[PDB]
Structure 1
Amino acid sequence: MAKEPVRVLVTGAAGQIGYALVPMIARGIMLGADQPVILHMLDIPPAAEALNGVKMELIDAAFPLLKGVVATTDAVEGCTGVNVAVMVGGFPRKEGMERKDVMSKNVSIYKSQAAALEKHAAPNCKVLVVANPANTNALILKEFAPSIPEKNISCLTRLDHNRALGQISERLSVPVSDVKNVIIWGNHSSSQYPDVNHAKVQTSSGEKPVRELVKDDAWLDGEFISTVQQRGAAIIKARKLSSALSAASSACDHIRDWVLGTPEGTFVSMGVYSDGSYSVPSGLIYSFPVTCRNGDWSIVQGLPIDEVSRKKMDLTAEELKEEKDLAYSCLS
């Protein structure tokens, strides 16, 4: 059991995802059962009363790992000293909208808070952008925080990844604990490529490829992909709010694997700063298969890329370039 706590910022903390996420952090799901945490929660002045209400409930839960809660609308205060920053602040989309449709309202948040994190967060702070459009908000953050190490900025495609795992589990009627190594390439949008070519299912007679067990490449290459791409809109249709329980849980998984490491034999999807791997342009926030060790991600190199995969990977890269240019047009 560590004595030194980790300071974790959650922005957007008075909203749906924040409310689902902060108790998971307090209970040890993000950084481990033996790691005390201090929470910093940041929202905006219209939500000040609700934000204080969330803090009151965190206190009321008597979480033994929790060693402090700062609940504020002051970004300097919220960002000071933080070691992990999970950026959820921003507007959600409504039923019928695309994830890109909250760009105009949200990208200015990321331009502004980039400077607060750069000046005030702990030097090696790990940043995870959840708010949509996730990759482009993270890219804007990176470009306005040039002194944050490029490796420390990421966005959340782990919910797309977990959705893909869940679809395979349901299709095959096997526990999701037995399914691994799907890949989400590219943008958190309908251009993502949910790829099962490298995915495995543990069975009583060994690890088997997903395609070998599904025996329906047509489904995997068609309805499976559109189901994963459109899953967030399906949740909003069912609930009248977009996917907070599963987004919060997936953000815990993203940070946990990044900090504590991926298990041997497993890789996961993370939106990270592209370096030229897989012939994707460098300088995007782009989702890749990664392993994590010693607190750093490493792209899984050496995977075979067929021509269909190549085209999908290039299309999503081009969409990310277009979104970045439109984001700058939305900024002053």
Structure 2
Amino acid sequence: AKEPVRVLVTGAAGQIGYALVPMIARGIMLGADQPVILHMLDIPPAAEALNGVKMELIDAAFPLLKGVVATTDAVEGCTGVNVAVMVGGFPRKEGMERKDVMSKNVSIYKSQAAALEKHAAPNCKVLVVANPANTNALILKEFAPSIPEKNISCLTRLDHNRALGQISERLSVPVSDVKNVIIWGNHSSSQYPDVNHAKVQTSSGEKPVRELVKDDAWLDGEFISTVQQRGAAIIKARKLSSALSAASSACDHIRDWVLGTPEGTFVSMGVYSDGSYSVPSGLIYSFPVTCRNGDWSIVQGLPIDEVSRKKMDLTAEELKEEKDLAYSCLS
């Protein structure tokens, strides 16, 4: 706890960035006893707003915060960083086509991969939040071949937490009593929110979610659609995509990765596939994982039924489609 961790947030002058940086400064990401230095990266049109954010961080008198670099220079932003949370991008607005959203975002990741690879600290842990999350991360990984493949991840923790919240609300139990949902595959409407291995603490012990809900039709239909469409639902309610919950879930992702998952719990992370669960290797794909010693490990040995298999493959195929589109934009 004497030495500080350097944490980069790209897209720092945006909505998620604004929600996220004070959570990091308060110790929510790396623990209450871990000092942090923030590096905040955005682009020249947001230079004033970015300086504004730094002014606020200073103004909060955060005792764990030992420095703030606020910049539009990617080299400076990436120098010496130990954690990189990549939020820089352009959210889809009405009128944009899927190709334009892809093209505007993957170019960022191609470019910033070189800056991270050359300047970040060696065992830097990387989390891509910007959409399309898995594909942006895959592009980053491909353009930064010197970064250990296990050190690149994308955020499906918001999907995971959304799923936990849906179960909590459906049963009217506290969310702290629900665990071990799984989000398989892409951060998109093709994801598989899987409750086959999930549990709820009750007065008579841990029970499986399906036994308490007693409505397989709901779990297999509307529950899944609800999680798949939840980001669009936030936009409908707020006229803006999620931020408070994306930031909080990015803290959870990093925190669990670095400090470890609790005994008996697994969480979802988009990680570089190795062939586990017969998912094609070389995709950024969400798996159930446990974390220990700063490393993720896919939870092996879960039974997979026919319906689960088919959903897992469908989302893998979407990820291949996205990869092809990204490639198309970059050539």
TM-score range, shorter chain: over 0.9
Cα pair 1:27 1:33 within 8 Å, conserved:
yes
Report the CA distance shift for 1:99/1:219 in structure 2 as closer, same or farther (over 3 A).
farther
Q: Which moved more, 1:206-215 or 1:317-326?
A: 317-326
Cα pair 1:95 1:236 within 8 Å, conserved:
no
Q: Deviations over 1:29-75 (max 9, x none)?
A: 00000000000000000000000000000000000000000000000
* 1:277 equivalenced with 2:238 (yes/no): no
TM-superposed CA distance for 1:328, in Å, is 1.0
Question: Within 2, Cα distance between the matches of 1:244 and 1:193?
Answer: 22
Q: Deviations over 1:265-287 (max 9, x none)?
A: 00000000000000001000000
**What is residue 71 of structure 1 aligned with on the other side?**
70
Question: Within 2, Cα distance between the matches of 1:64 and 1:283?
Answer: 41
Cα pair 1:100 1:132 within 8 Å, conserved:
no
Cα pair 2:126 2:151 within 8 Å, conserved:
yes
Question: Within 2, Cα distance between the matches of 1:304 and 1:253?
Answer: 26
TM-superposed CA distance for 1:322, in Å, is 1.1
Report the CA distance shift for 1:101/1:257 in structure 2 as closer, same or farther (over 3 A).
farther
TM-superposed CA distance for 1:96, in Å, is 8.6
Question: Within 2, Cα distance between the matches of 1:90 and 1:99?
Answer: 14
Question: Within 2, Cα distance between the matches of 1:100 and 1:6?
Answer: 37
Q: Deviations over 1:185-244 (max 9, x none)?
A: 000011100000000000111000000000000000000000000000000111111000
The secondary structure found in structure 1 opposite 2:29 is coil
Report the CA distance shift for 1:200/1:35 in structure 2 as closer, same or farther (over 3 A).
same
TM-superposed CA distance for 1:94, in Å, is 2.8
TM-superposed CA distance for 1:254, in Å, is 0.1
The secondary structure found in structure 1 opposite 2:8 is strand
Q: Which moved more, 1:100-109 or 1:4-13?
A: 100-109
Report the CA distance shift for 1:250/1:100 in structure 2 as closer, same or farther (over 3 A).
farther
TM-superposed CA distance for 1:102, in Å, is 2.1
Cα pair 2:99 2:325 within 8 Å, conserved:
no
Q: Deviations over 1:8-49 (max 9, x none)?
A: 000000000000000000000000000000000000000000
TM-superposed CA distance for 1:104, in Å, is 1.4
Question: Within 1, Cα distance between the matches of 2:234 and 2:205?
Answer: 34
How do 1:168-187 and structure 2 match up within 5 A? 168-187=167-186
Q: Deviations over 1:266-318 (max 9, x none)?
A: 00000000000000010000000000000000000001111111011011111
**What is residue 3 of structure 1 aligned with on the other side?**
2
Cα pair 1:161 1:183 within 8 Å, conserved:
yes
Question: Within 2, Cα distance between the matches of 1:214 and 1:94?
Answer: 37
**What is residue 194 of structure 1 aligned with on the other side?**
193
Report the CA distance shift for 1:60/1:269 in structure 2 as closer, same or farther (over 3 A).
same
Question: Within 2, Cα distance between the matches of 1:226 and 1:144?
Answer: 34
Question: Within 2, Cα distance between the matches of 1:255 and 1:174?
Answer: 26
Percent of aligned pairs with the same amino acid? 100
TM-superposed CA distance for 1:97, in Å, is 7.2
Report the CA distance shift for 1:3/1:156 in structure 2 as closer, same or farther (over 3 A).
same
Query: What TM-score, normalized to structure 1?
Result: 0.98
Gapped regions of structure 2 (runs ≥ 5): none
Question: Within 1, Cα distance between the matches of 2:94 and 2:236?
Answer: 6
Cα pair 1:5 1:38 within 8 Å, conserved:
yes
- Equivalent residue pairs, number: 331
**What is residue 316 of structure 1 aligned with on the other side?**
315
The secondary structure found in structure 2 opposite 1:85 is strand
Report the CA distance shift for 1:26/1:98 in structure 2 as closer, same or farther (over 3 A).
farther
Question: Within 1, Cα distance between the matches of 2:265 and 2:93?
Answer: 35
Question: Within 2, Cα distance between the matches of 1:70 and 1:248?
Answer: 19
**What is residue 100 of structure 1 aligned with on the other side?**
99
Question: Within 2, Cα distance between the matches of 1:97 and 1:319?
Answer: 20
The secondary structure found in structure 1 opposite 2:240 is coil
Question: Within 2, Cα distance between the matches of 1:125 and 1:248?
Answer: 19
Q: Report the RMSD for the aligned CA atoms in angstroms.
A: 1.2
Cα pair 1:85 1:126 within 8 Å, conserved:
yes
The secondary structure found in structure 2 opposite 1:230 is helix
TM-superposed CA distance for 1:331, in Å, is 1.3
TM-superposed CA distance for 1:101, in Å, is 6.2
Cα pair 1:95 1:237 within 8 Å, conserved:
no
Report the CA distance shift for 1:37/1:138 in structure 2 as closer, same or farther (over 3 A).
same
TM-superposed CA distance for 1:103, in Å, is 1.2
Cα pair 1:290 1:299 within 8 Å, conserved:
yes
Cα pair 2:10 2:40 within 8 Å, conserved:
yes
TM-superposed CA distance for 1:100, in Å, is 7.6
